[PDB]
Design an enzyme around this catalytic site. Structure first.
Site, PDB file in Angstrom:
ATOM      1  N   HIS A   1      44.390  49.452  37.401  1.00  0.00           N
ATOM      2  CA  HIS A   1      44.737  49.231  38.799  1.00  0.00           C
ATOM      3  C   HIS A   1      45.829  48.174  38.975  1.00  0.00           C
ATOM      4  O   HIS A   1      46.375  48.060  40.072  1.00  0.00           O
ATOM      5  CB  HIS A   1      43.492  48.990  39.667  1.00  0.00           C
ATOM      6  CG  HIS A   1      42.948  47.590  39.656  1.00  0.00           C
ATOM      7  ND1 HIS A   1      41.821  47.209  38.948  1.00  0.00           N
ATOM      8  CD2 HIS A   1      43.346  46.494  40.333  1.00  0.00           C
ATOM      9  CE1 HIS A   1      41.562  45.939  39.200  1.00  0.00           C
ATOM     10  NE2 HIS A   1      42.461  45.488  40.053  1.00  0.00           N
TER      11      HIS A   1
ATOM     12  N   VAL B   1      54.798  25.825  37.579  1.00  0.00           N
ATOM     13  CA  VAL B   1      55.553  24.746  36.954  1.00  0.00           C
ATOM     14  C   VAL B   1      55.869  25.147  35.517  1.00  0.00           C
ATOM     15  O   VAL B   1      54.967  25.576  34.782  1.00  0.00           O
ATOM     16  CB  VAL B   1      54.737  23.426  36.974  1.00  0.00           C
ATOM     17  CG1 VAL B   1      55.510  22.281  36.322  1.00  0.00           C
ATOM     18  CG2 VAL B   1      54.344  23.038  38.406  1.00  0.00           C
TER      19      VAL B   1
ATOM     20  N   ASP C   1      39.163  51.916  33.936  1.00  0.00           N
ATOM     21  CA  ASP C   1      40.153  50.968  34.481  1.00  0.00           C
ATOM     22  C   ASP C   1      40.738  50.102  33.356  1.00  0.00           C
ATOM     23  O   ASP C   1      40.404  48.916  33.185  1.00  0.00           O
ATOM     24  CB  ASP C   1      39.513  50.105  35.563  1.00  0.00           C
ATOM     25  CG  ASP C   1      40.515  49.301  36.385  1.00  0.00           C
ATOM     26  OD1 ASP C   1      41.741  49.548  36.259  1.00  0.00           O
ATOM     27  OD2 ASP C   1      40.069  48.413  37.157  1.00  0.00           O
TER      28      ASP C   1
ATOM     29  N   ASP D   1      31.744  33.964  40.383  1.00  0.00           N
ATOM     30  CA  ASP D   1      32.244  35.334  40.178  1.00  0.00           C
ATOM     31  C   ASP D   1      33.759  35.273  39.945  1.00  0.00           C
ATOM     32  O   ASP D   1      34.409  34.245  40.183  1.00  0.00           O
ATOM     33  CB  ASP D   1      31.922  36.178  41.430  1.00  0.00           C
ATOM     34  CG  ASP D   1      31.985  37.694  41.251  1.00  0.00           C
ATOM     35  OD1 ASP D   1      32.214  38.219  40.136  1.00  0.00           O
ATOM     36  OD2 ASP D   1      31.769  38.361  42.309  1.00  0.00           O
ATOM     37  N   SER D   2      34.322  36.384  39.471  1.00  0.00           N
ATOM     38  CA  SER D   2      35.759  36.606  39.539  1.00  0.00           C
ATOM     39  C   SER D   2      36.117  37.136  40.934  1.00  0.00           C
ATOM     40  O   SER D   2      35.240  37.432  41.757  1.00  0.00           O
ATOM     41  CB  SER D   2      36.230  37.522  38.398  1.00  0.00           C
ATOM     42  OG  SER D   2      35.569  38.786  38.416  1.00  0.00           O
TER      43      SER D   2
ATOM     44  N   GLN E   1      39.837  38.447  43.684  1.00  0.00           N
ATOM     45  CA  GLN E   1      41.200  38.964  43.819  1.00  0.00           C
ATOM     46  C   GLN E   1      42.206  38.082  43.080  1.00  0.00           C
ATOM     47  O   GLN E   1      42.208  36.863  43.236  1.00  0.00           O
ATOM     48  CB  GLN E   1      41.558  39.019  45.316  1.00  0.00           C
ATOM     49  CG  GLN E   1      42.914  39.592  45.620  1.00  0.00           C
ATOM     50  N   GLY E   2      43.074  38.706  42.283  1.00  0.00           N
ATOM     51  CA  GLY E   2      44.049  37.997  41.475  1.00  0.00           C
ATOM     52  C   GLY E   2      43.586  37.704  40.058  1.00  0.00           C
ATOM     53  O   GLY E   2      44.430  37.389  39.185  1.00  0.00           O
TER      54      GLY E   2
ATOM     55  N   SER F   1      41.973  40.218  38.482  1.00  0.00           N
ATOM     56  CA  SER F   1      41.988  41.580  37.956  1.00  0.00           C
ATOM     57  C   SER F   1      42.864  41.694  36.727  1.00  0.00           C
ATOM     58  O   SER F   1      43.973  41.160  36.680  1.00  0.00           O
ATOM     59  CB  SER F   1      42.527  42.542  39.003  1.00  0.00           C
ATOM     60  OG  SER F   1      41.577  42.780  40.018  1.00  0.00           O
ATOM     61  N   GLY F   2      42.363  42.460  35.763  1.00  0.00           N
ATOM     62  CA  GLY F   2      43.073  42.688  34.521  1.00  0.00           C
ATOM     63  C   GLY F   2      42.836  41.652  33.437  1.00  0.00           C
ATOM     64  O   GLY F   2      43.183  41.901  32.271  1.00  0.00           O
TER      65      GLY F   2
END
Ligand SMILES: CC(C)(C)NC(=O)NC1CCN(C(=O)[C@H](Cc2cccc(C(=N)N)c2)NS(=O)(=O)c2cccc(-c3cccc(C(=N)N)c3)c2)CC1
Ligand SMILES: [Ca+2]
Length: 223
Positions: A40, A57, A84, A171-172, A174-175, A177-178
């Site tokens: 995704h 940075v 996925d 939890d994990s 958004q961002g 992912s992967g």
């Protein structure tokens, strides 16, 4: 990552940031030429950023390398997120060092209750939005398939597992992912999806990498 801690610079040296003008997904370095991420996260124009801590940075240990090809799993379903997983080839091999290092693939699937390290630059709030610039970390156990399916009836396939805390708060998000889920030195998971972030009875759902090792090995050898 919600409810985690600051990892420390370059303490997760297989973690990569996928950048298309901005960070949009994580990934994991599996050898000097190849990154594993979520299907995704597919798009054109990916630059892989290795050796990162603060993604805003230049700190002196980064390598920035364009992708030369991306291979989404043949059976990926973008609605349900079954399968996925995606491979990204680097245009030039990364220089491997103590801050830029590969992570081993599973030799089998892992047991429920095993502790894992989940990492990323995603949102740190379960309600609202705040993005960190340094890498965040979370220790979380693999949950039983029965508790995963009970949380997500009709949604979990044999290519998914849950990890985290049914009480919420950790939890994990958004961002993330992967990015990686590493358990006992093996990349057992890829950050895939969940219902919201860090909500009660809605644990994180992760691609079950152990089912893909043969596909990974054969695909990279022929590309
Ligand atoms: N980009 C992109 O187009 N896709 C992304 C959007 C972000 N995303 C999420 O899962 C988000 C945040 C997130 C991210 C990572 C980990 C967690 C975590 N809690 N550990 C949480 N949750 S969401 O808003 O509820 C949401 C939004 C959209 C789709 C789903 C979804 C997908 C497949 C199956 C099901 C199903 N219900 N069976 C639900 C769910 C991953 C997919
Ligand atoms: Ca940096």
């Amino acid at each position: 990552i919600v409810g985690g801690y600051t990892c420390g610079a370059n303490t997760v040296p297989y973690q990569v940031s996928l950048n298309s003008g901005y960070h949009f997904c994580g990934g994991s370095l599996i050898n000097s030429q190849w990154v594993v991420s979520a299907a995704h996260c597919y798009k054109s124009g990916i630059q892989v950023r290795l050796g990162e801590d603060n993604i805003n940075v230049v700190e002196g240990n980064e390598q920035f390398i364009s992708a030369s090809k991306s291979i989404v799993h043949p059976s990926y379903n973008s609605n349900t997120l079954n399968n996925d997983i995606m491979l990204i080839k680097l245009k030039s091999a990364a220089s491997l060092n103590s801050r830029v290092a590969s992570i081993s693939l599973p030799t089998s699937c892992a047991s429920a209750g095993t502790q894992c390290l989940i990492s990323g630059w995603g949102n740190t709030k379960s309600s609202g939005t705040s993005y960190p610039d340094v890498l965040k970390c979370l220790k979380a156990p693999i949950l039983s398939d029965s508790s995963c399916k009970s949380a997500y009836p009709g949604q979990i396939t044999s290519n998914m597992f849950c990890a985290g805390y049914l009480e919420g708060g950790k939890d994990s998000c958004q961002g993330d992912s992967g990015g990686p889920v590493v358990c006992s030195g093996k990349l057992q998971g890829i950050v895939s999806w969940g219902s919201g972030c860090a909500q009660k009875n809605k644990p994180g759902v992760y691609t079950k990498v152990c089912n893909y090792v043969s596909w990974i090995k054969q695909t990279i050898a022929s590309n």
